[PDB]
Amino acid sequence: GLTYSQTMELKDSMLQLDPNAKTWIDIEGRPEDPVEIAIYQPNNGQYIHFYREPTDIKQFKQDSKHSHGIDIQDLFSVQPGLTSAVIESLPKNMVLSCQGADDIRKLLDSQNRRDIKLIDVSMQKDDARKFEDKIWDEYKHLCRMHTGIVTQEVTPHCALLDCLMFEAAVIGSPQIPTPRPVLSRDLVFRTGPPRVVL
Ligand SMILES: [Mn+2]
Ligand SMILES: [Zn+2]
């Protein structure tokens, strides 16, 4: 997982979160094997967003085709250990918002963070994704990892854009403060993005 350097750097970045502010959390992949996690504070735009290689390639490929459309080959360049490091450093008794809490509860409990409380906004399925297209149009530049065609052909689920669109649904408008990542790209990825030489 992370080095001492990376652990110290991760911890400093996470202090940029406001412990009392509304915080969304969303994940892609099962809670025992997640591949994408986003923790997002709408009021100030800050978000923690990272990825993880799957242990179970069989289930991953199903999730790829029917949910997030992530290419497993893209995940080989993501930094391991972030999931446990981030969840360990979340503030004591922090309260997080989510759309469906069952999988998040298991993931947090698995990290011995039962102290973290979940507010399940429990939105109707389509009410929750009312602003999906407008969120994807404005903010899909923020995540490059959903490259496959997803079927159920629907828009793929991104943990980060899910958080953004759930917030837009609550407030009835795509008008949210500008999202801004707190993690350094060099902490999220262990090898830089390859550009096609043209
Ligand atoms: Mn999602
Ligand atoms: Zn994404």
**Cα 30 to middle of ligand 1, angstroms:** 11
Instruction: Show the CA angle centred on residue 75, arms to residues 27 and 2, nearest 5°.
Output: 80
* Binding site residue list for Mn(2+): 26, 28, 162
Residues 6+ apart with CB under 8 A from 198: none
Q: 31 C-alpha vs ligand 1 centroid, how far in Å?
A: 12
- Token pair belonging to 43: 């009021």
| Shortest-distance ligand to the CA of residue 135 | 2
Point out the annotated binding site for Zn(2+). 36, 143, 146, 158
User: Ligand 1 center to residue 99 CA distance, Å?
Assistant: 8
Name the residue with tokens 């509860």: 105
In the β-sheet with 180-181, what is the strand arrangement from edge to edge? Answer: 117-120, 95-98, 24-28, 36-40, 46-51, 180-181
Q: Cα(67) to centroid of ligand 2, in Å?
A: 11
Q: Is 52 helix (H, G, I), strand (E, B) or coil?
A: coil
Experimental method: X-ray
Can you say which residues are annotated as belonging to the binding site? 26, 28, 36, 143, 146, 158, 162
What gap in Å lies between CA 123 and CA 79, rounded to an integer?
33
Q: How far, in Å, is the centroid of ligand 1 from the Cα of 28?
A: 5
Angle between helices 159-171 and 132-139 (to 10 degrees): 120
Residue positions forming the annotated binding site for Mg(2+) = 26, 28, 162
What is the distance between the alpha carbons of residues 101 and 53, in angstroms, rounded to a whole number? Answer: 22
DSSP-derived secondary structure letter, 157:
P
